[PDB]
Structure 1
Amino acid sequence: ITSAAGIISLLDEDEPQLKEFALHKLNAVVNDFWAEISESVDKIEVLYEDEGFRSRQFAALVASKVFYHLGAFEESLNYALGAGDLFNVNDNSEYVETIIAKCIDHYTKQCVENADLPEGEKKPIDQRLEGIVNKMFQRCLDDHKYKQAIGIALETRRLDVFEKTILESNDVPGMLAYSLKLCMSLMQNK
């Protein structure tokens, strides 16, 4: 409650047991004290960087949370990628939703910019981003909403996942007519 300076202050101490409770407390109390922790964001970045820390992923998650709340969405996206597995895709939360959307957008932008390039100089894509997008593909399929998965596949230019979603369908000829229509419809690249 208030102040919220100590939980920060209990972080320099080189005792990797107080660091953990400080981390979880900052998580629990970030939503109302993101600003203050943002002033002290360098410390948590250092802590994440230190591989010795066991709970590095939780630190990366907290760093993404504070960066996201700040407004700087690129740093938040990078560190959210760094959060690894703890990025529970299945949280009906504002943060998770906005960050996944930002991720889909960046992946689409990279894919479009990379498609029209030689095989020599394809910009590498983060594996964490790829994992998150594939997870979102899996969620979309499992919900059974084929149309959304097809659309994300097209925008991202991914033809493999498009092919998957095309086959694993209870309305194969119907959604195949859908696909042809969309092809002759307002999509331009030749």
Structure 2
Amino acid sequence: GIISLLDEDEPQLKEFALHKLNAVVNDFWAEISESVDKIEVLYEDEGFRSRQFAALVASKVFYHLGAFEESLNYALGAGDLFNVNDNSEYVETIIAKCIDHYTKQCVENADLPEGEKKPIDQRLEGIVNKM
């Protein structure tokens, strides 16, 4: 019910409510599925300090809904608040798919030596060598 707090248009009310999101996102799984439209926005809303810490709670709800590439791109957009983490059942699965996405990318890039390679994000290879 704190999604109603996320409607209200001041900044310091937002992050306190979405500090409360990843506190109980493991207990209120599917209610946040309707708040997807609010977050996928707030992430596009650039001038606020509520975009990477919103990309955390975005990555949690697509993880429950099975949207795994959605959790993959948004844990990239979660920035350093995701990359600092090392121990959960959550984080080790989406970085395992990140290795899966990376090794199917690199073999695909090995198929075409004549330039034409893919633009590769650097946070995903930044956690490859971190691993």
**TM-score in terms of structure 1 length:** 0.66
Query: 1:88, CA displacement in angstroms?
Result: 3.7
1:64 aligns with 2:59: yes
CA contact (8 A) 2:5 2:17 kept: yes
Q: CA 1:105–1:89 in 2, change beyond 3 Å: closer, same or farther?
A: farther
Query: 1:49, CA displacement in angstroms?
Result: 1.1
Distance 1:9 1:132 in 2: 35
Q: CA 1:90–1:59 in 2, change beyond 3 Å: closer, same or farther?
A: closer
State the structure with bigger RCO (CA 8 A, min sep 6), 1 or 2: 2
Q: Which runs of 5+ in 1 are unaligned?
A: 1-5, 137-190
Distance 1:91 1:120 in 2: 35
Q: Which runs of 4+ in 1 moved over 4 A?
A: none
Query: 1:119, CA displacement in angstroms?
Result: 3.3
CA contact (8 A) 2:83 2:127 kept: no
Query: 1:90, CA displacement in angstroms?
Result: 3.8
Matching residue of 2:69: 74
* Paired-residue identity, %: 100
**Which is higher, the Rg of structure 1 or of structure 2?**
1
CA contact (8 A) 1:11 1:19 kept: yes
Distance 1:20 1:61 in 2: 12
**TM-score in terms of structure 2 length:** 0.94
CA contact (8 A) 2:42 2:50 kept: no
Q: CA 1:90–1:43 in 2, change beyond 3 Å: closer, same or farther?
A: closer
Please give the secondary structure, in 1, of the residue aligned with 2:47: coil
Query: 1:134, CA displacement in angstroms?
Result: 1.7
Q: CA 1:119–1:84 in 2, change beyond 3 Å: closer, same or farther?
A: farther
- RMSD of aligned residue pairs (Cα, Å): 1.2
Between Structure 1 and Structure 2, how many residues are aligned?
A: 131
Distance 1:74 1:87 in 2: 16
CA contact (8 A) 2:22 2:57 kept: yes
